[PDB]
Design a protein around this motif. Sequence first.
Motif, PDB file in Angstrom:
ATOM      1  N   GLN A 184       7.778  19.996   1.765  1.00  0.00           N
ATOM      2  CA  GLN A 184       6.275  20.071   1.753  1.00  0.00           C
ATOM      3  C   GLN A 184       5.832  20.994   3.065  1.00  0.00           C
ATOM      4  OE1 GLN A 184       2.680  21.163   2.190  1.00  0.00           O
ATOM      5  NE2 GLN A 184       3.898  20.542   0.184  1.00  0.00           N
ATOM      6  N   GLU A 185       6.375  20.528   4.327  1.00  0.00           N
ATOM      7  CA  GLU A 185       6.146  20.991   5.618  1.00  0.00           C
ATOM      8  C   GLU A 185       6.408  22.351   5.599  1.00  0.00           C
ATOM      9  OE1 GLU A 185       9.016  18.779   7.988  1.00  0.00           O
ATOM     10  OE2 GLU A 185       9.862  20.786   8.761  1.00  0.00           O
TER      11      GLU A 185
ATOM     12  N   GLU B  48       4.225  24.274   2.810  1.00  0.00           N
ATOM     13  CA  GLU B  48       2.819  24.583   3.008  1.00  0.00           C
ATOM     14  C   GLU B  48       2.774  26.099   3.336  1.00  0.00           C
ATOM     15  OE1 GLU B  48       1.259  25.348   5.939  1.00  0.00           O
ATOM     16  OE2 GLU B  48       2.376  24.764   7.702  1.00  0.00           O
TER      17      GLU B  48
ATOM     18  N   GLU C 180       0.901  29.628   1.659  1.00  0.00           N
ATOM     19  CA  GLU C 180      -0.043  29.909   2.831  1.00  0.00           C
ATOM     20  C   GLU C 180       0.300  31.577   2.841  1.00  0.00           C
ATOM     21  OE1 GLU C 180       0.713  28.089   6.638  1.00  0.00           O
ATOM     22  OE2 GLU C 180      -1.803  28.804   6.693  1.00  0.00           O
TER      23      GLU C 180
END
Length: 31
Positions: free
Chosen positions: A16-17, A20, A24
């Motif tokens: 996820q980190e 993102e 983005e």
Amino acid sequence: SAQEEAEAEERRLQEQEELENYIEHVLLRRP
């Protein structure tokens, strides 16, 4: 909790980190 579940947990944070940033930029640079 457990060892197996613990391994999957972090997996989501690392995925996820980094994810993102994916959407983005992908969305920001949309067509």
